[PDB]
Amino acid sequence: QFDPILVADIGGTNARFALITAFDAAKNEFVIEYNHTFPSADFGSLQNATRHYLSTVPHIKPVRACLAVAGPIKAGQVHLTNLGWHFSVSEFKQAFSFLQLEVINDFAAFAYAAPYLDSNQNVVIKAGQADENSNIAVMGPGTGFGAACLVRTAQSSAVLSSEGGHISLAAVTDLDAKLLIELRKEHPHVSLETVFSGPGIAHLYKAMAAVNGITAKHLDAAQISNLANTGECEVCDATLNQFCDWLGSAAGDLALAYGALGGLFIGGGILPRMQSRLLESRFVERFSQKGIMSQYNGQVPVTLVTQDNIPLIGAAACLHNS
Amino acid sequence: QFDPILVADIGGTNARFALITAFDAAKNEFVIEYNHTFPSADFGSLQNATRHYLSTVPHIKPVRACLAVAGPIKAGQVHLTNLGWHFSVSEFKQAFSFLQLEVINDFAAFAYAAPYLDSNQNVVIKAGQADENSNIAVMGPGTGFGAACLVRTAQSSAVLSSEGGHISLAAVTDLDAKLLIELRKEHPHVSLETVFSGPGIAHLYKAMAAVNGITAKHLDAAQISNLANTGECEVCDATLNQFCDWLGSAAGDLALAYGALGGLFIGGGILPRMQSRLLESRFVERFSQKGIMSQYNGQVPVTLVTQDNIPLIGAAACLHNS
Numbered sequence: 001q002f003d004p005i006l007v008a009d010i011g012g013t014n015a016r017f018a019l020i021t022a023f024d025a026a027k028n029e030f031v032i033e034y035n036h037t038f039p040s041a042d043f044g045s046l047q048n049a050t051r052h053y054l055s056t057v058p059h060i061k062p063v064r065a066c067l068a069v070a071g072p073i074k075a076g077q078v079h080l081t082n083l084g085w086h087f088s089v090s091e092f093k094q095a096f097s098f099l100q101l102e103v104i105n106d107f108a109a110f111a112y113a114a115p116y117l118d119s120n121q122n123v124v125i126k127a128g129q130a131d132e133n134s135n136i137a138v139m140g141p142g143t144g145f146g147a148a149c150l151v152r153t154a155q156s157s158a159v160l161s162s163e164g165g166h167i168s169l170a171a172v173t174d175l176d177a178k179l180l181i182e183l184r185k186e187h188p189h190v191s192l193e194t195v196f197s198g199p200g201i202a203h204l205y206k207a208m209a210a211v212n213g214i215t216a217k218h219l220d221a222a223q224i225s226n227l228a229n230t231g232e233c234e235v236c237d238a239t240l241n242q243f244c245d246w247l248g249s250a251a252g253d254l255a256l257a258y259g260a261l262g263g264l265f266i267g268g269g270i271l272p273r274m275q276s277r278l279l280e281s282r283f284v285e286r287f288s289q290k291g292i293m294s295q296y297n298g299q300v301p302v303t304l305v306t307q308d309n310i311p312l313i314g315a316a317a318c319l320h321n322s
Numbered sequence: 323q324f325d326p327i328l329v330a331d332i333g334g335t336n337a338r339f340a341l342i343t344a345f346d347a348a349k350n351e352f353v354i355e356y357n358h359t360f361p362s363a364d365f366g367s368l369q370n371a372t373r374h375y376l377s378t379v380p381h382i383k384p385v386r387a388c389l390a391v392a393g394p395i396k397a398g399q400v401h402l403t404n405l406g407w408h409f410s411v412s413e414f415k416q417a418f419s420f421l422q423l424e425v426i427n428d429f430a431a432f433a434y435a436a437p438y439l440d441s442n443q444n445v446v447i448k449a450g451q452a453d454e455n456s457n458i459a460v461m462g463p464g465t466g467f468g469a470a471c472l473v474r475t476a477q478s479s480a481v482l483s484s485e486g487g488h489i490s491l492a493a494v495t496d497l498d499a500k501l502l503i504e505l506r507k508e509h510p511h512v513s514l515e516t517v518f519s520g521p522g523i524a525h526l527y528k529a530m531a532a533v534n535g536i537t538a539k540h541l542d543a544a545q546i547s548n549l550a551n552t553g554e555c556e557v558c559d560a561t562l563n564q565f566c567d568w569l570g571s572a573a574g575d576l577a578l579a580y581g582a583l584g585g586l587f588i589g590g591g592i593l594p595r596m597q598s599r600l601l602e603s604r605f606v607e608r609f610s611q612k613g614i615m616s617q618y619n620g621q622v623p624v625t626l627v628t629q630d631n632i633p634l635i636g637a638a639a640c641l642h643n644s
Contacts, residue, residue, distance in 0.1 A: 075455075076476075102477060133397075135482060147579070151473050151480040154398075155424060155644060158473040158480040160457060160581065166615040167575040170492035171502070180493070189613030253489040257469070257579050259482065291511030293488040322477060 005319055006062040006098075007032075008050070009311035011070030011080055011106065015040045017053040018309070019060055020316040029116055030316040032309060034060075040083045047087065047095055054096075066102040066315035068109035078103060102319050104159075107146040109314025110138045110267055111159040114150050116317055117265075118307050123275060125266065126284045126302040134261035137254050139164075140268030141200070141247070145193040149258040159318075164254065165193040172249045172286065175211070175242065182207035192250050198270060201225075201243060208239045221270070241281055244274065248283030252290055255300050267305040275304065327641055328384040328420075329354075330372070331633035333392030333402055333428065337362045339375040340631070341382055342638040351438055352638040354631060356382075362405045369409065369417055376418075388424040388637035390431035400425060424641050426481075429468040431636025432460045432589055433481045436472050438639055439587075440629050445597060447588065448606045448624040456583035459576050461486075462590030463522070463569070467515040471580040481640075486576065487515040494571045494608065497533070497564065504529035514572050520592060523547075523565060530561045543592070563603055566596065570605030574612055577622050589627040597626065 005020035014037050022031035034057045043049040046067075054061070071080045076089040093101040104112070114136040136150040145165030151158050169190050171177040183190045183203060195204050201221040209216030212235055219227065219236070227233030228240055255264045271278060288297035307313075327342035336359050344353035356379045365371040368389075376383070393402045398411040415423040426434070436458040458472040467487030473480050491512050493499040505512045505525060517526050523543040531538030534557055541549065541558070549555030550562055577586045593600060610619035629635075 104477075108475075149482060151482045153430075153480050153483070155426075155640065156478060156480040158475050158478040160471060160473045160482055161475070162579055162581040163615050163618060164579040164581075166578045166612055166618075168492035168494060168571065168612075170490035172490060177499070187613070189611065189616075191613055191615075194613075249490065254579075256488045257484055257486040257576075259484040259486075289511065290488055290490075291509070291513055291516075293485050293513075294511075296485060296488075318477065 003064055004060050004062040005316055006050075006054070006065040007312045007315035008065075008067040009106070009315070010040070010046060010067055010085075011083070013040060014038065015049055016312065017050070018312050019057060019062060020320070021060070023320065029118065030313055030320075032312055032316070035309070035312075040085075044084060045087070046085045047092065050096065063097065063099045064319055065096070065098050065100070066104065066319035068104055068106050068311035068315045070106040073103055073105060100319060100322065102315075102322065104315065104318055105161055106311055107138065107140070107148040108159045108161050109311045109318065110140065110146075110265070111136065111148040111150040111314070112317040112321075113310050113314035114138055114263070114265055116313055117303075117305065121307045123304040123306055124301070125278065125304050126287060126300075128301050129299050130263045130301050131261040135259045136262035137258040137260035137264040139251060139254055139264070139266055141196040141270045142268040143198055145196050145200075146268070147254055149260065150262070152262060160258070164257070165196075166191045169195060169250070170253070172246075172289070176246060176249075178211050179204070179207045179242070182210045195243065196247055196250060201239070201270075204243055205236060205239045208242060209235050212238075225274075240274065240277055244278045244281035244283050245286055248281070248286035249289070251283070251302065252287040252297050255287070255297055256290060256293055260300055261296075263301045263303060265303050265305050267310060271304060272306050278304070325386055326382050326384040327638055328372075328376070328387040329634045329637035330387075330389040331428070331637070332362070332368060332389055332407075333405070335362060336360065337365075337371055338634065339372070340634050341379060341384060342642070343382070345642065351440065352635055352642075354634055354638070357631070357634075362407075366406060367409070368407045369414065372418065385419065385421045386641055387418070387420050387422070388426065388641035390426055390428050390633035390637045392428040395425055395427060422641060422644065424637075424644065426637065426640055427483055428633055429460065429462070429470040430481045430483050431633045431640065432462065432468075432587070433458065433470040433472040433636070434639040434643075435632050435636035436460055436585070436587055438635055439625075439627065443629045445626040445628055446623070447600065447626050448609060448622075450623050451621050452585045452623050453583040457581045458584035459580040459582035459586040461573060461576055461586070461588055463518040463592045464590040465520055467518050467522075468590070469576055471582065472584070474584060482580070486579070487518075488513045491517060491572070492575070494568075494611070498568060498571075500533050501526070501529045501564070504532045517565065518569055518572060523561070523592075526565055527558060527561045530564060531557050534560075547596075562596065562599055566600045566603035566605050567608055570603070570608035571611070573605070573624065574609040574619050577609070577619055578612060578615055582622055583618075585623045585625060587625050587627050589632060593626060594628050600626070
């Protein structure tokens with residue numbers, strides 16, 4: 001009989017709670033039940049939010065818990081000053097008499113989750129052959145660019161949390177190069193996140209406009225994607241294709257940096273909205289265009305994550321594999 | 323009473339064996355004794371080399387062993403076809419009745435070793451504040467460019483082995499940019515290893531010569547370093563300074579990619595021979611020139627490794643921490 005786990009996805013506008021009630025060895029999937037979302041604004045503390053949630057499912061009183069936090073964890077201390085939630089992992093554990101409590105970052109949760117994803121609920125960007133005994137890379141263009149790695153060796157395993165979104169962005173093509181020169185005019189340091197993010201799409205548009213000899217209007221990502229579709233902004237359509245192309249190069253670099261023969265997953269909320277453009281782009285060609293390591297990246301499967309509960313699956317995987 | 327460990331550094335022209343006989347909690351150092359080197363060519367198998375070594379120190383019969391291999395480990399199989407040594411980890415363990423045997427890559431050993439280095443036997447490249455609970459990055463420009471990371475979290479730890487030397491090399495300065503254009507003329511894929519390695523120094527020289535409007539002579543790294551010193555090759559001196567400068571940028575990128583708040587170590591045999599030039603270069607300035615993550619890299623201590631037994635210390639740390 002599986003020992004239930006309380007899992008939570010906190011830090012954003014909405015806090016999400018659920019109960020892990022079983023693990024199916026066949027499907028290699030955690031069974032998640034009683035999935036409840038609520039505005040973080042409804043509570044003055046995480047403790048309160050948690051007490052409320054547990055009161056709605058009192059027949060299952062978990063003594064194991066893991067919270068995935070889209071915020072900073074500095075020495076057993078969590079500060080979501082944004083929400084007004086500040087708590088000690090130690091006291092939170094005490095408050096609910098948890099025998100086991102893990103508090104992890106959201107991308108760390110994405111890395112923990114990687115081996116337990118719904119195969120039939122995701123999109124293969126590039127086939128195909130995963131090495132079960134090697135590392136898995138996870139990345140996600142969103143508000144910023146997050147990158148992490150589930151490190152698996154013949155001695156142990158752990159999750160590499162990083163600031164990999166901030167590494168310098170390299171040029172591969174002549175167009176890349178020209179765009180870096182323009183980008184650097186507004187961004188002394190042009191990193192992955194300078195381009196591969198919600199704000200980055202706007203940055204990339206401004207640069208593309210400049211390269212094409214056009215004064216750029218004040219557009220954000222959604223506006224850029226819309227105007228591209230209606231054919232009212234040629235530079236917008238080219239910007240989004242360049243985004244996909246370049247991303248391929250960056251994803252390939254991270255696959256090498258993280259030795260990701262276990263596979264590379266692309267999450268976040270932006271890329272799943274660009275699925276058709278991504279699959280039509282030069283992403284895959286650029287992904288494995290890596291000199292003597294071309295064959296290596298040729299073997300690495302790249303998957304676009306489409307399921308919605310990654311943080312919860314990760315929290316579950318983290319605590320259960322402790 | 324410490325349980326002795328047999329440690330070995332194999333794969334190169336010389337095989338090195340030693341015995342770990344104790345661990346000093348105060349110094350935080352493994353005690354290494356009976357350090358013996360011998361030409362790999364003297365034996366037809368690792369088993370033979372090992373039997374010979376153990377016969378010279380028969381009063382200490384270790385049942386724990388860890389081999390650091392500068393070669394490939396594919397599924398409990400080691401193939402140093404170069405030396406004619408091919409063995410099964412399983413059978414090697416059996417052959418010497420080891421209760422515990424770990425076989426790791428050489429850079430993985432460098433990552434394992436990082437926390438146990440001789441503070442007074444290394445050179446601070448950039449101060450200063452290590453976070454004991456964060457990851458440590460290790461890198462080394464040699465024949466190729468190796469990169470690994472000791473991943474340390476509040477849940478576990480592991481060593482990230484990578485192909486990070488093969489990620490695209492980004493330009494930061496105008497000179498960087500011009501050099502990439504030249505480099506790409508001979509190297510379709512310009513990676514870190516294209517520049518930051520023994521062969522890379524020659525590549526960089528050829529490119530620097532071209533940028534400076536000079537026909538480059540056929541020189542290798544040592545020749546480039548020599549001619550620089552005698553002032554017989556101005557472009558050579560500029561090449562080596564550019565190498566150090568650019569390396570700073572690359573090391574900074576890896577520190578971000580690996581979340582290396584625990585520190586970053588630079589090993590290999592090339593950089594320790596360039597200590598004065600390195601410390602006089604723009605390495606440190608470029609290391610932390612990383613936009614919003616500038617403060618982050620400002621905190622990361624960078625150390626030049628000068629001690630000779632890194633692989634042995636790593637093997638020891640790996641097996642002992644199993």
